[model samples]
Target chain A: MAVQIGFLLFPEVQQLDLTGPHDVLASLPDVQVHLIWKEPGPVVASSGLVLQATTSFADCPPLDVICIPGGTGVGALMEDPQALAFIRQQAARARYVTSVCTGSLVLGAAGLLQGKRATTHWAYHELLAPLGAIPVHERVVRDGNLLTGAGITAGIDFALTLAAELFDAATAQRVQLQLEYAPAPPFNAGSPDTAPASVVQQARQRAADSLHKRREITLRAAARLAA
Target chain B: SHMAVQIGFLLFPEVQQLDLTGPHDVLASLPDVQVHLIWKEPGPVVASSGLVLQATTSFADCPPLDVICIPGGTGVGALMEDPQALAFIRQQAARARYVTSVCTGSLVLGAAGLLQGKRATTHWAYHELLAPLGAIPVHERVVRDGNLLTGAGITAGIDFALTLAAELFDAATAQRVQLQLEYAPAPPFNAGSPDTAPASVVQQARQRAADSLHKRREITLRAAARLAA
Candidate 1:
């Protein structure tokens, strides 16, 4: 039987978060990967690349794995009831409930992540506490059926981890070899811990406005969860 | 002073999406930068990975570009001798400030007579073919030969883009783009290249690529023959 994997294709979502995982998931043997949205001809990513969704939420079949990829759009997604409902509806049966970057927050909004161990983009890692989730600082973290990844590029790592759980380690490694997943980054500034203090400060400052809005919106969702 | 930096990406059927998108995202983030996906016509093109991308500009409609990038995939070998594609590339190269490629796209550049005696790099698997194409194959993630920049393999496009950003604008600009991208990558396995992968894994990957590798060599040799003629 083919595994049906679906990725939520939302406006302003980071293209890499969706594209990286999609390549890994789509290349898996006997897997049918999909891009899904509420209504779409195409959705423009934050970086301006256009992505066409293969199915709408209303028409989407039950998925074996449902992924939510994060970007600047997460701030608005935290308050979108329709998108949250779709996530909740799918999570009930998805063999793997997963997210990359800040997509975990959307899962939190849907009430599936309460008390679940998870992770997100490092800058937003602390906010997981407000949503009743334990924050783990790692590239990919798993709490039962829920899997979350940190930051943008972590989606590739997250997908390989899930692929192992779905099949076998050897199976995942073969796919890794095919994609040449051996990474040699030209710089070592991927995370704040290793980045120069100046880059870290500039990065933090650059996203301060979005982070502020994310905090306000996440707190509201947390309050709703409590009620 | 107010003009934007124009970057054009050539789109073809079965082009690798990441090679273009990675660089596009990084370059588009720069100040006053405009991106155009060029093909023979304006329409949707399916990448080798099955993702669809829109090519917004046609060869005839393309504006002058400061930089032109060609990405590689299964589709690249086909373009190795394609007249229309080669013509478009040669025409663009005549005036573009920088001519570049990622992965096997460098092979397409070679087919167009752009890499003669140039220091370039390409996917490690395809490295041997470059010498026949008249390029001094440099084994690195990215190689800069004057105004021509070549990147090795698929994922190296991001690194190539960051490096290009520094040259086109400044190092600080590249750093800013990298920071926004969270360019730190962590792979779950060390099987990306033949050298790091276990013998079993390497054999499997090589076996998977065996068919295409044959075709790539055939196409490259024929193109090299054309260059000699």
Candidate 2:
């Protein structure tokens, strides 16, 4: 059977969030990975990478897995009726529902994370609690059919983990070797815990503006959820 | 210097999108940096991984980039004989501050006659093949010989870019960029290279990669011989 995986593409998405996992998922045999949006066109990601959507919401095929990758744009999508409804429609039938980074917040907005153990980017992990999720502090969290990966780089881990679940361990390892998934970083400053307090402060400062805005947005979405 | 550093990545079909995007995600965040995805045709090119990326600049129209990075995948084999693409790389390398490649993209560089006497590295499966193109293949994740920076395999692009980032700016600046991307990678399996992957998994991967390997070998031999001739 052919596997269909759709990624919700939007403006301001951390391009790596989609590209990292998309690279891993697309390597699977008999698979079609769809960059799905409201319309078919090019979307400039947060970092300025241009990604094209092949399938629109109206034209999207039934997905085996529906994934939402995260960034600042996710906050807007959380309040978007069309995007949230699209996710809800897909999540109701998809075999596995997943999110990377702040994409979990989008999942929460779609009203799908109630009581589900989930995770998101380290900076936005606390936001998951507001959305009625059992927040899990980890790289990748799996609860039943829901999978969430933390931060931008966690998409690679999330995709590889999802591959193993979709097939078997050998299959996942095989794909891992094909992509040369060995991990080595020039710096250890990838996470808040691993980074210097100053570096973490710098990172927080960089994201402070967006985080401030997203917090307010999350509150509004959470208030809506209460009603 | 407030002068904008122009960083251009070669965008071609069948490119392991991550090879380009991984490095791209790192470099695009650099302060006062301008990134361009360049190809012969400025349009959408579907990667082997099923993702579509748009080429924002044409090969002929591109500015002389400070860093020219080529990313490799199944489609790079097509670039081995592409005169325009090879010519474009050579044109950029002649004036580019740094020349670089990720994964098998070095193979494309080798095809362009740019790797002669250059020390570089590529994907683990295709590492040894670099010798035929007159490049000294290094086994490290990221290898820098003079201005030519090469990274090994797909995931190594991140390290390659981070290393290049530190070189272009200061270590502190690159470290900050690394923190922003949250690039600490934790793979579910430690099977990224043949050296660490399970014997059976390696065998299976090698078997699956056999055809691409064979085809690439042919292109390298032909390209190398042509360069020598």
Candidate 3:
């Protein structure tokens, strides 16, 4: 039987968060991947890439795996009751409840990450605690059926990990080879610890506005969760 | 001073979406930068992975670009001898500040006579074909020889674009973009390249790609002959 995998697509979502995992997961044998959204039409990503969803939330069939990717749009998703309800309904029965980058924040808002060990983009990783989830620093973290990844590029790692879980190491490795996933980054500035302090400060400053906005929304969402 | 840095990405049938999308993410993040997905005809282009991308411009209507990027996939080999595509690349590359590619996209650049005598890199499986086109094959993630930049394979496009981003703009901006994308990649397996993958896996991959490789060689030979003539 084919494993039905669905990725939630929303306006201003990071294209890589969706495309990276979509590439890896769909490459697997007997897997059907769907891009789910509020409605079926073109949605523009933060980077201006337009992605069209394949199915609407109401039309979505039962999925074996459900993924939510993170981007600036995630701030709005936190307050979207309909979006949260859908995630809650899906997580109730899905074999794997997953997210990449700040997508975990949405899952957290949906009350799905309560007391679960999870990770999100480094910038927003700590926010998980506010939602009653333990923050993990790893690239891909799994606590039972809840799998969350850190940052944008971590989607690839998250997918490969999920692939290994569904199949075997060799199968995932083969898929790895097919995509040439062996990464040799030209620069070692991927993480704050590895990057120069100046660069880290600059990055933090650049993200200050978005981070501030995200915090306000997160606090509100967390308060709602308590009630 | 107010003009945007124009970057054009050639979209073709069966093109690897990541090869274009990965770099697109990096390049589009630069300040005053614009990315255009171009094709022979403006329409929907399906990638090898079955993802659909829309082309925003046709070859005839595409504005002159500062950067010309071609992505590679099962669809690239057939483009080696395409007159229209080659002409479009050659035209934009002549005026573009950077002529770049990822994966087997280098082979398409070679077809356009753009990589002759230049040190370039491509997908490992097709590295041998570069020498036939009078190009020195460099087996690295991203190879820069003058204005031409080539990446080894699909995922390397992200690295290549980041490097290009630093060159086009500044290191600080590139770093910020890297953080924005959170591009620290950690592949669960070490099988991303032929060097790191196990022998059995490499052989199996080669066997699977054999038919496409053979076809690429045949098309490349014909194009090389045309270049010589």
Candidate 4:
């Protein structure tokens, strides 16, 4: 049977969150993958950027895998009952439910990981606990059918993990070789821990005010859960 | 023309050179994959490297794409500020059976509300800034949060396309494509980001790039916020 994979689209979603993985999954010849959106037409992304979606929540069929990516929009969707419902339903039957970065936050908010272990972007790994998930610090962490990855660059590792899960290690290794998974990044300031004190401070200062914004969204999501 | 795949490569001004091109090479090497350079208009789109690409598809008329890709660069930081471009991507992503991106393309997806709580990857430079949409930024190159596969910066595109071919098709098929492309990558500098580079080199590079990258990131984040409402 074809793996009916559906990617979610909402307002202000991170572009790479979908596009990066879309690139990998769409290459599967017979496997059916699509972009699922709240509306049929264009949905604006987080940065005023744009991309097309192939399906909408109202029209999408049951998916074998439902992928939810995270970005600035999680706080809003946490409160969007309709979106949550759609996510919950699609994820229920999905063979593999996975997320990247703060996307785990959305899953947690959706109440999918009440006690499950997951991971997200390194910067916000601590937030998963508040959402009822045990956070792991690894780049690619797999728990049963739920697979989560680290920060923005960890998507490839996540894909490889999936490939390993679905197929054998040889297949995964071949794909890795093709993609040249042996990476050597040019800088070291990606994570807060590895970064210099100045860089870490700068990052903290940058996000100081957004905590309040995300906090409000969390509360709203809690209210939706109650509803 | 017995083309097997129709790849619509989204183009824009100042897009990251490696983002789309790396994957473009990977996809182009696919047997019978007819790749087209798509853009909002039928003209030249500039890349981050100052390279200009002649567009094949315009907003008014685009062919049905089996796969559609959006690449990020300084253009992304600016394009996220454009409604027309975002709408174009949103429309295409909704229809393309498979959608993908690289580098800061996640920002574009975020602007389009495509990454909401999905496992995804992007250029390591902007992971934390990407949290608003509920994305869990992964440091790996390619992430398959369900069917939505994403790649980090430049080289990850090859990984994205290759893994995609294997996952959707079969290993043999992916091998054929990879072999055709000579999928071996060799970077002499051994430095694509700060984490992998020498401290001094990392410092120098970041110092040189901080201004541009920061400004672009700020622009992209704001664009993402505006598109949300």
Candidate 5:
């Protein structure tokens, strides 16, 4: 038996949602990990940048765990019935299911969140219900076999939590110390509730455009679901 | 071609920077080891957390590695469903000596069907679902089943890399790497683990993160199917 993990990529996905966990997972010994994509070449993310993957889906092995991170790409995926169905099939059989940022939208779209409680980027907390979910306001949420992290930095906390769950608390604490999880953010604007009103407003305005797109995509996805 | 141990880590946008960065810091201390971030394309790949990293080589531009690594974050879901990316992982792995993952990245590997019948570990709370992929779910900091070594989460990455070094090289090498990392931890709260943490804290954390978690899982399900096909 060997350690194997796989990560998914899609268009316009948030960058941190994927990389934060990548740093932690690749640290272990004799682990086989892959950055897989629907295609084998460069995959563009939601950030207007591109990434190349190491593997393709066509003939990949039966993975030990498959992690899908979240971002703006998720909203679009939720609408794409092909993509939604694809997510539903894989997550249904994965050993563990997890998300970061707004990636919860993808899980909801896949129908995994029907009765489950979850969370997402605070900016989009209210959107989870379309897929049937209860929203929370915590940094990391674990329900049954699923794990979710808040906004961006929450991925680190989520990863730490995961370490404790799989291994002993000692091991988790050891890792926490190694990464220097002692949080000292340069700015206080990391979270909406804690940030100044102006910062929150700016974030909201910036998100406003994306929100419209999300609504459009949701409608499209809903139509497909109905069909 | 260098005959030295080459660890290739996949870098892409929206990936957790620490997922790769933390492990890279520990693993790079090996005297003969080279850690290369391989991307589908050349140049810089931005992380999900907003850290920009430079990729040394494009997929075809790189050499076969001794070890293959993939980190997790929001971008993983999309990458998992991307066929070209999965193909590259399979091909590189065929030649590489080992593969590894941490945190939710294990799910990405699981979706690739890379851990069937293997015993592995990931970031805690997600252990039960390991069975769907035919993997033996283990509760440990490091799951070492043959050539595969998976870790728990971001912090465990440091431990996992140290363990990998020990397994691949020697105990001394692992010790030296740990020493280099100044590997020691102290937290202000006892809630790092589910058992030690107050149930209320855990519950609150879960409530806050539910939405994003649900969305990520949904996309992963779709990506996993693409790999299964």
Candidate 6:
């Protein structure tokens, strides 16, 4: 049987969060990839790249894997019962429930991360603990059937790992070769621990407003889960 | 130096989305940078992976850009001999500050006569084809020859763009964007290149890429002949 994979598409989504994984996973043989959204239309990403959904929530089939990607738009879904409920329903049926970057927060908001080990964007990692998830610092974290990746570009790592689990290591390796998955960063500033203090401070300050907004919604979602 | 740097990526049917998106994410992060997704028309363009991107501008409406980046995919073979595309690339590259490509996009640049007698790189599977078009095929993740920069394969787009960012902006700006994107990649496997990949895996990937490469070769030859004519 073919493996069916679905990625959630939302306005302001970090385009790479979806496209990076989409490039890797879709390369697998006999795999059907679907981009699902609340509605069918052009949804512009935070970077101004426009993506169109291939399936709607009502029309989506039961998927073997359901992926949620993070961006500036993901914060709105923290309190959106509709989006959370969709994730809850899909997570229940999907063999592998996954998220990339801040996407793990949405899965957490859906109450799926309670007692699960997960990860998200580094700037928002502290928030995972409050959502009942054990925050891990790894690029990709796996707890049972739930898988999560950290920050924007981690989706590529996350998908290749998932690809191995879904099929076999060799298949994943072949796909890796196909996409040339080897990486070489020109600088040494990807993570907070490695980045110069000044760069980290600027990044944190730049993200302060969005981080504050995310904190408020995460708290609201935590309360709702508690109630 | 804060002048708005206009960067454009050519989008088309069956183009590799990551080839454009990886660089787009990095380049768009630079200060005073404007990105344009250009196609023949302003419409939905489906990538080889089924991801769709809408073109923001047409070739005719595009302004003179500071950087012109071409990405590669299955559809690139068709573009190898596309008159309109080659014309646009040649025209834009003539005045652009930098002419660059990712993956088989170098093939397109070659098709536009930009890679002739220049050291370049492209997807490993099609690297040999570059020599036929008067390009010096260098086996590197990213190769810079004069003002032209080329990268190898799909994921190399990230590396190529980061290198371009540092050149266009500064090391600090590139590093900041890299941090913001969390670009310290950790691939789960080590089959990214023909040399490192298991021989068996490399053979299989070559077979999978056979059709596209074959088509690209035919069109590239034609484009070369036209350039000579």
lDDT of 3 by residue, B1-229 (tens): 3499999999999998999998998787788888899998987888988788889999999999999999999899778878999999999998999999999999999999988999999988889999988899888889999999999878888889999999898887888788767778878889988888988999989999898888888999999998999
Candidate 4, residue B183: CA error in Å? 22
Docking class of 5: incorrect
lDDT of 4 by residue, B1-229 (tens): 5656777777888876557755665555455677777777776565544334467678769777777788877777767777787787788778777778877787778777788888787776566656765587777777877657887865666677777777656655555444322232332233445565456654554565578767866775676667577
Could you tell me how far off, in angstroms, the CA of residue A74 lies in candidate 4 after the best superposition?
1.5
Which of 1 and 5 is the better model by TM-score? Answer: 1
Q: Give the alpha carbon lDDT tens digit for every residue of B1-229 in model 6.
A: 3468899999989998899999998888888788999999998898988888899999999999999999999898788878899899999998999999999999889888888789999988888899888998898899998899998889999999999999998888888888889888888888887788899998888888788777777888888898898
True interface contacts reproduced by each model, as a fraction? 0.50, 0.83, 0.66, 0.03, 0.05, 0.81
Task: Looking at model 3, give its docking quality level.
Answer: medium
Task: List model 6 lDDT by residue over A1-227, tens digit each.
Answer: 79999999999999999999999999898999999998888888998888898888999999999999999999888888888888888888899999999999999899999999899998899899989998888999999999999999999999999999999998998988888877877789999889999889989988899889888999999999999
lDDT of 6 at A226: 97
TM-score of 6: 0.98
Find the candidate with the highest DockQ and give its number.
6
Candidate 2 — which residues are off by over 4 angstroms? none
Q: Could you tell me every candidate's TM-score relative to the true structure?
A: 0.96, 0.97, 0.98, 0.54, 0.52, 0.98
| Model 5, position A118: C-alpha lDDT score | 86
What is the per-residue lDDT of model 4 for residues A119-168, given as tens digits with 9 covering 90 to 100? 87655666777677787767677788888766544555566567656665
Tell me the whole-model lDDT of each prediction, alpha carbons only: 0.87, 0.89, 0.90, 0.66, 0.66, 0.90
DockQ of each: 0.61, 0.78, 0.73, 0.02, 0.03, 0.81
Q: In model 5, what lDDT does residue B61 have?
A: 77
Every prediction: chain A TM-score: 0.98, 0.97, 0.99, 0.90, 0.89, 0.98
- Residue B93 in candidate 5, Cα distance off native in Å: 40
| A1-227 per-residue lDDT for model 3 (tens digits) | 79999999999998999998998888899999888999987888998888888899999999899999999899999999999999999988999999999999999999998899999998877688999898888989999999999999889899999999999988898888888887877677889878878888988887889988988998999999999
lDDT tens digits by residue: candidate 5, A46-118: 4334556766676546666666777767766776666666566667676677777777777777677767878
Which pairs of residues collide in candidate 1? A182-B192, A190-B184
Q: Find the 10 residues in a row with the least total lDDT in model 4 chain B.
A: B180-189
